Structures are given as structure tokens and as C-alpha cells.
């Protein structure tokens, strides 16, 4: 009874069959497969060496010789030439597997890009059919000038890093050296957002207050009140005097360390504000909200220059936003786990990055002008290169705990990461330098000092703490 | 299907194996055989409905059948069959050489036969003259 092995495709003298598949195998081959993988090679069911039935009928007889095979050395010649084809066939398979996986990635990319067109066109059609169904009778020049100034002044820093930069061997010895508590009421605990400017800092809380605090003077500098709901984000201006704050009551309010009153209120959002970002010159503030609009506004007068939906014709929660530090483009991250890059000059999408598997709670841009990082509830962190709009490297925690915050250092040598624990990556190596878990709850903000000489973090644990070596 | 039933001698469309069997049976054959006989057609083991498993082909990953006739296993096989033949040939040659070499070693009388001839002829040379 002629039989052939499902593993090798050759005849077999000893056919055998697994109890968990209909396929037939050569005994010594399937046993070695079971010995490595413990499973059926074709149905992938669990399989053991005793679950085999022996097809003990008469096996396949020898093939006839080729006429050249009638001599022992010509059999050795024939065996050598046979082996070279078998080797090259095996090499062709691993080449073909690389090509197939390469083409599948491109194919899925093109299909994904096509679904974006489908979604945009489907909404245009719905709005058109809705209209039928209810039918009744120098700013742009300044930015390039400023961005080219900003990106050109960077070039010396890109060629040489500061000589005062803290070493990796120093950052490996980071320890808790300051702790501050009681900044917000224990009845509605946790710092919801933080920003720093040297030893100066600004904090939000669930208690509706905004408090400006100096973690070197151990004292409150000023307190601001008037928000109807909890504070989600804050920004401390480079002038050390102006303070910016955003509330879940859909309004942004602006404050001064010198003043007991609201410097401005910016009625521009229809929904709770989730994240905000500061332009590199400090002249203007950018914001995002659950209403899916980004909006760009004057910090002082509250007038808005332009406003466009992150996903026109749809509502999607936007969870992170940040300017590229040259200030002409900014990245946005939303609950669809799409990251969209916008050009402020055209006020249009410059790039779009499908990436993470869950909502992008944080985005960071490097002051080298080309590394980008995005962080998500799925517990991965990924590095992006804007020079080709591509990924470089990925890092993750295997427990998939959400990451709430990210920050590059001011030189863009280090990346701080915050979730259920505190971590810092040296980005050029993409290696974890240290991990710290001293907070008893989720981390809510990461910031760096000058020359990476200090690290600042906040948490729902009612504490603000600083680490140094 | 290319499997031929060991009992009916015709090609299957429903191949079945059981743990006490070895030749292939058809499903539509063995179930009536269980009902009348209850007995394995070849091994005469007891048959039961939980023993039978049915074969299938064309699943994912299944290697393509090599039809080119040459293969590494078959060449190593026939090289092994050459070696078995040559050693059994060499053994019977070595056996024959041992037997022939043995008896010619025992047959080495030439020096002692010569001394007997010398002894005989020297007797003759006296017997030829005492008359």
C-alpha cells in the first residue's frame, strides 16, 4: 500500500496517523515534530507519541534506479546533486516567507488607507443624503521664519550635546530626594496634571482649584479658583508669571501669579478639555477636547485664528496633543489609536500614523526635531522618525498596564515614561536605565530638569516628588 | 481516492483506520462488518464504533508530494542495500579464503615428503648393490 508523508512529501516505509488528524506521517519525522512542539503539525491540536495508529500494511517499495545510478560513485554524485537542490529549495522557502510577509504588510497598509477614504466619503454621502431628507424651502511667513530660526539654532546642539549632561551611570543612581504633600484636598485626592519651569510648578486637582507651587521653596506661590469642574491639564508659561489651565467645564481659563483674577477665559470648546500644548514661542496655545476639534487661540484675548475637526463628520475622543518643537506642525492622538500630524500653515493633515492598539493618552516630540513618541493604554511605547514618517523601535511592559504620560528631556537624549510606575529611557540606545515604583497609584505627569540633572513626577498618591542621584 | 481497500480491492472514498487494524477499510464497509461480524476483517480483534478514525488530505502546511523519483532517503536506502550486499559477499569470500588458506597450511608436507624420498632412494641405492 503506497503512502507518502505529510511532513516531507516523500514515500514512507513506516506510515503512521495521528488520532487528532486524518493526515499520515513517517514515524521518525512526526516523533521529532512531537518531541519539539507537542502538537499535530496540520491541525495544531495537542498530540502525544502514544496517540498514533500504525498503518502497518506493506510499505512503498524502492524506486527504480536511474541509469546513472547503477554505480556507487555515480550514486554519490547523484546524492550530492540531489542534496544541493534540497538545500536551495529550503533556502527558497525562507526567502519566499520574507517576501510574502513583506507584501502582506504593504497590502494591509493599502487596505487600511483605503478604509480612511471610505470613511471620509461615507460621511460626505450621509451629510448629502441628510440634506435631501430634511430639505425645506504674514502669520504663515512668521511661522516659517520662526521655525527655520528654531530648527537652525538647533543644529549646533544637534552636532554637540552639552558637556554638563548627566551621565547614564549617574541616572542609574536616581533616588528620592524631595517629597511634597497636601497640595490638594484629601477629600478629592490626586494631582491630575503637572507642569514645571525649574523649581516653579503648577498643579491641577479634582478639588476644582488651581494651585501654583514651588517644590524648592516648599510653599504655595498662588491659588486660583473659579472652575466648575476638575482640572485635566495645566501649562506654565516660560515667563514664570503667566499660568494656563483647562477644565472639564469646556472652558480654558488663564491666570497670572501676580493677579487674584482671571486674566482670560477662552470659550472655544463644546466638551471637556483633555489636553493642551504650548507653542515654542509662547505666543499662542493649542487645545483638544472630547468634541474632536482642535482649536488654536490667543492666550490673552481668547480670539481664535482657526479651528478644524480632527475627524470631520464624526465624533472621536482626542486624548493627546503636542507641538513639534519648531512649532509649524503638531501631533494628535485619539481613542481610535490613530495619530494624525497636522501642518499649521495649511491647517491640514500632514501625516497620519496607525500605530498603537489602544487610545493614545500621551504624545511626545523630541527637540532634536525628528524623534517622536506616543503612549497608550495598551502599555507599548513606540519611537517614530519624521524624516521618513516611520517607526524606529518599540518598547512595552508585558502586563499591558496603561501609560498615562510621556516626556522627552530638554535635550532629547532621554525619554521619561509614566503609568503605574516611573521609567526613563535613554532613547539613542533604547534601553531602560532605571524603573521606579514608589508611587502607590497611577502616575499623572513626567517632566525633566535642565541638563537632565533632575527628574520630576506626580501621581494620584497625593504627593509631588523629585528624584536625583 | 487513491487508497485501495484491502478487503474489497477497490478505491476508497471514505478511508477508515482503527487501532487494532492495519489495512484500510471503507466506512460504508466496516459498519456493516461490525454489525454482522463485530470482528476485525484482518486481525480478528474486537471492533467498536469509538475505534474508527477517518483520514483526510489537503490541510494547511501539507508538503507537496515529490514525484521526481530521486530522493535523499531512497538514495541512502539503496546505498545501504549496496553495503549489506558487499559485506555479505565479502563475508563469504573471507570464509572461502579462510578454508582454502587453512587446508593448504595443513598440507605443507613438501619438506617432510622430500626427506622420505631421500630416505627411500638411499635405501634403494644400497638395495641396488647388495644383490
Amino acid at each position: 500500500m503506497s503512502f507518502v508523508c505529510g511532513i516531507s512529501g516523500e514515500l514512507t516505509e513506516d506510515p503512521v496517523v495521528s488520532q487528532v488528524s486524518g493526515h499520515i506521517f513517517d514515524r521518525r519525522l512526526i516523533v521529532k515534530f512531537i518531541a519539539e512542539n507537542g502538537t499535530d503539525p496540520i491541525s495544531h491540536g495537542e498530540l502525544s507519541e502514544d496517540q498514533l495508529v500504525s498503518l502497518k500494511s506493506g510499505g512503498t517499495g524502492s524506486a527504480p534506479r536511474n541509469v546513472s545510478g547503477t554505480s556507487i560513485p555515480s550514486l554519490l554524485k547523484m546524492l550530492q546533486d540531489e542534496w544541493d537542490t534540497v538545500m536551495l529549495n529550503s533556502f527558497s522557502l525562507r526567502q519566499q516567507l520574507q517576501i510574502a510577509r513583506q507584501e502582506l504588510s504593504h497590502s494591509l497598509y493599502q487596505h487600511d488607507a483605503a478604509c480612511r477614504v471610505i470613511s471620509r466619503l461615507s460621511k460626505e454621502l450621509t451629510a448629502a443624503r441628510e440634506a435631501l431628507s430634511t430639505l425645506k424651502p504674514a502669520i504663515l511667513a512668521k511661522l516659517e521664519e520662526k521655525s527655520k530660526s528654531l530648527t537652525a539654532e538647533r543644529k549646533q546642539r544637534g552636532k554637540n550635546l552639552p558637556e554638563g549632561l548627566a551621565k547614564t551611570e549617574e541616572l542609574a543612581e536616581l533616588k528620592q530626594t524631595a517629597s511634597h504633600t497636601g497640595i490638594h484636598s484629601t477629600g478629592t485626592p490626586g494631582i491630575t496634571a503637572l507642569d514645571i519651569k525649574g523649581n516653579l510648578s503648577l498643579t491641577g486637582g479634582i478639588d476644582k482649584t488651581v494651585v501654583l507651587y514651588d517644590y524648592e521653596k516648599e510653599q504655595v506661590m498662588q491659588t486660583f479658583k473659579g472652575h466648575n469642574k476638575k482640572i485635566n491639564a495645566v501649562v506654565l508659561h516660560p515667563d514664570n508669571i503667566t499660568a494656563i489651565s483647562a477644565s472639564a467645564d469646556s472652558h480654558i481659563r488663564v491666570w497670572s501669579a501676580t493677579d487674584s483674577s482671571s486674566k482670560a477665559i477662552i470659550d472655544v470648546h463644546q466638551a471637556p478639555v483633555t489636553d493642551i500644548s504650548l507653542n515654542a514661542s509662547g505666543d499662542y496655545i493649542l487645545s483638544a477636547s472630547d468634541d474632536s476639534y482642535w482649536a488654536f487661540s490667543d492666550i490673552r484675548s481668547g480670539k481664535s485664528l482657526c479651528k478644524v475637526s480632527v475627524e470631520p463628520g464624526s465624533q472621536i475622543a482626542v486624548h493627546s496633543i503636542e507641538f513639534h518643537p519648531d512649532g509649524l506642525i503638531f501631533g494628535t492622538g485619539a481613542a481610535d489609536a490613530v495619530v494624525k500630524i497636522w501642518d499649521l500653515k495649511n491647517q491640514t493633515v500632514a501625516a497620519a500614523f496607525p500605530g498603537h492598539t489602544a487610545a493614545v493618552r500621551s504624545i511626545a516630540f523630541s527637540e532634536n526635531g525628528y524623534y517622536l513618541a506616543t503612549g497608550s493604554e495598551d502599555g507599548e511605547v513606540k519611537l517614530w522618525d519624521l524624516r521618513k514618517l516611520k517607526n524606529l523601535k518599540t518598547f512595552a511592559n508585558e502586563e499591558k498596564q496603561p501609560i498615562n504620560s510621556l516626556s522627552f528631556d530638554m535635550t532629547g537624549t532621554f525619554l521619561g515614561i509614566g503609568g503605574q510606575k516611573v521609567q526613563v529611557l535613554h532613547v539613542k540606545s533604547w534601553s531602560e536605565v532605571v524603573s521606579l515604583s514608589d508611587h502607590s497609584g497611577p502616575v499623572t505627569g513626567v517632566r525633566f530638569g535642565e541638563n537632565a540633572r533632575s527628574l520630576v513626577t506626580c501621581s494620584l498618591d497625593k504627593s509631588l516628588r523629585v528624584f536625583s542621584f | 481516492m487513491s487508497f485501495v481497500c484491502g478487503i474489497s480491492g477497490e478505491l476508497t472514498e471514505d478511508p477508515v483506520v482503527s487501532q487494532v487494524s492495519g489495512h484500510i477499510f471503507d466506512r460504508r464497509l466496516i459498519v456493516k462488518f461490525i454489525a454482522e461480524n463485530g470482528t476485525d476483517p484482518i486481525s480478528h480483534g474486537e471492533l467498536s464504533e469509538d475505534q474508527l478514525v477517518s483520514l483526510k488530505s489537503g490541510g494547511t502546511g501539507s508538503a507537496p508530494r515529490n514525484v521526481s523519483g530521486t530522493s535523499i532517503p531512497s538514495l541512502l536506502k539503496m546505498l545501504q542495500d549496496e553495503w549489506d550486499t558487499v559485506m555479505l559477499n565479502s563475508f563469504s569470500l573471507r570464509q572461502q579464503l579462510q578454508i582454502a588458506r587453512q587446508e593448504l597450511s595443513h598440507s605443507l608436507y613438501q619438506h617432510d615428503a622430500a626427506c622420505r624420498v631421500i630416505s627411500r632412494l638411499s635405501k634403494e641405492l644400497t638395495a641396488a648393490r647388495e644383490a
Partner: peptide, 26 residues
């Protein structure tokens, strides 16, 4: 061991006897 497939040669010869000839056993 090599030309054992001659068993099928006599089966082909058998087929020429079973076709175009007498009854099989009963």
C-alpha cells in the same frame, strides 16, 4: 531487496490470465 517489485510483474501476468480465461475459485 531492490527488484522486489517483480511481484507486480506476475500480477500483470495474472491479470492477463484472469481476463480472457477461466473461473476463479469457489
Amino acid at each position: 531487496h531492490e527488484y522486489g517489485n517483480v511481484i507486480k510483474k506476475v500480477e500483470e501476468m495474472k491479470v492477463r490470465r484472469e481476463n480472457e480465461m477461466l473461473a476463479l475459485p469457489t
